A paper describes a structure:
The periplasmic ligand binding proteins (PLBPs) recognize diverse ligands and deliver their cargo to membrane-bound members of the ABC-type family for selective uptake into the cytoplasm. However, structures of metal binding PLBPs of cluster 9 family display a distinct fold wherein a rigid α-helix connects the two terminal domains. Towards this end, we have determined the crystal structure of native (non-recombinant) ZnuA from E. coli in a naturally zinc bound state. Superposition of the two independent molecules in the asymmetric unit yields a root-mean-square deviation (r.m.s.d.) value of 0.3 Å for 933 backbone atoms and therefore we are, for the most part, presenting and discussing molecule A. Structure of ZnuA-Ec possesses a pair of (α/β)4 sandwich domains which are held together by a long linker α helix that is tightly packed against them.
The asymmetric unit is composed two protomers of ZnuA (molecules A and B; 520 residues), and includes two zinc ions and 527 water molecules. The metal binding pocket in ZnuA-Ec is formed at the interface of the N and C-domains. Zinc is coordinated by residues His60, His143, His207 and a water molecule. While the histidine residues coordinate zinc via Nε2 atoms in a trigonal pyramid geometry, the fourth ligand water occupies the apical position. Interestingly, Glu59, which is close to the active site water, makes a direct long coordination bond with Zn2+ (2.8 Å in molecule A and 3.3 Å in molecule B). Intriguingly, however, ZnuA-Ec possesses a unique disulfide bond (Cys252–Cys306) in an unexpected location, between strand G and helix h. This disulfide bond is surface exposed, and is a novel feature of ZnuA-Ec, as it is absent from homologous zinc transporters. However, in ZnuA-Ec, which we propose presents a snapshot of the bound state, there is no equivalent water. Instead, we propose a “partial domain slippage” mechanism which stems from small yet significant conformational changes in multiple locations of ZnuA, which together potentially drive binding and release of zinc. In this light, we assign the present ZnuA-Ec complex with zinc as the metal “bound” state while other previous structures like ZnuA-Syn may represent initial conformational steps of the metal “release” state.
Author numbering: 27 to 116, 139 to 308
């Protein structure tokens, strides 16, 4: 199997590995990449993986050690890909699985590695990469269209996970409650967010399923601000050939459900 650190990385891997090998995901649904320790059974999967795929040590630091022990031919470290370095945005935001362009680079790297590891599967791997890129292009056209009328509407997200996606599709967030969703915002920060929401005529605040939404709801009350929910880890999406496109589509729907 290809073992992916986080579900959306698993989504990309599962487009490319479909009908070639299985894809497994380390981080369970409901858990957060900002607050995780590997289980003994997580450590097992890694040593036995045909290929490991992760963002890198500035993201999933809990994986750096066992990953450093593997051969280079048995890993893809997304944030260190030569194609990815030029695309990193300000040091750098590591929420890379939400960048369609980084997703392509990641697909390419996975394809290359699997072609080496599994030469019998070259044709299917080639076809998979082809299909992935076609589907992604359609998805980007669709998502761009869905989000176009929402450009300029201000909102707050719970944590700073969405930058690549927002930049690609022209969404205009006013800010985030937290950088690390592990760190409690503080009351001062919370009334300041509300002032900004009210003053700058924001339309939404967004909770996330991995974190209790109490604080998001508290900031909204009194105001005209609607509450939505964004899931940066695609919990409700099953791994599979079309999962990545489904993920980007669902995220777009989550923004639109509130912002429209
Ligand atoms: Zn995050």
């Amino acid at each position: 199997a290809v073992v992916a650190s986080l579900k959306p990385v698993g989504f990309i891997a599962s487009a490319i590995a479909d009908g070639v090998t299985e894809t497994e995901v380390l981080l369970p649904d409901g858990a957060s990449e900002h607050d995780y320790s590997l289980r003994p059974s997580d450590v097992k999967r890694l040593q036995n993986a045909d290929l490991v795929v992760w963002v890198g040590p500035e993201m999933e630091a809990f994986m750096q050690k066992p990953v450093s022990k593997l051969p280079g031919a048995k890993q893809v470290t997304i944030a260190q890909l030569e194609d990815v370095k030029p695309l990193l945005m300000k040091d750098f935001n590591m929420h890379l699985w939400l960048s369609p362009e980084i997703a392509r680079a990641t697909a390419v790297a996975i394809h290359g590695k699997l072609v080496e590891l599994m030469p019998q599967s070259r044709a299917k791997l080639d076809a998979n990469l082809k299909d992935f890129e076609a589907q992604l292009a359609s998805t980007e056209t669709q998502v761009g269209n869905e989000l176009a009328p929402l450009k300029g509407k201000g909102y707050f997200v719970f944590h700073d996970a969405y930058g690549y996606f927002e930049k690609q599709f022209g969404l205009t967030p006013l800010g985030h409650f937290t950088v690390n969703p592990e760190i409690q915002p503080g009351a001062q920060r919370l009334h300041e967010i509300r002032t900004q929401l009210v003053e700058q005529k924001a339309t939404c605040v967004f909770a996330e399923p991995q974190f209790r939404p109490a604080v998001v709801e508290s900031v909204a009350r009194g105001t005209s601000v609607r509450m939505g929910t964004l899931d940066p880890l695609g919990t409700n999406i099953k791994l599979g050939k079309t999962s990545y496109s489904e993920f980007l589509s669902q995220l777009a729907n989550q923004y639109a459900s509130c912002l429209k």
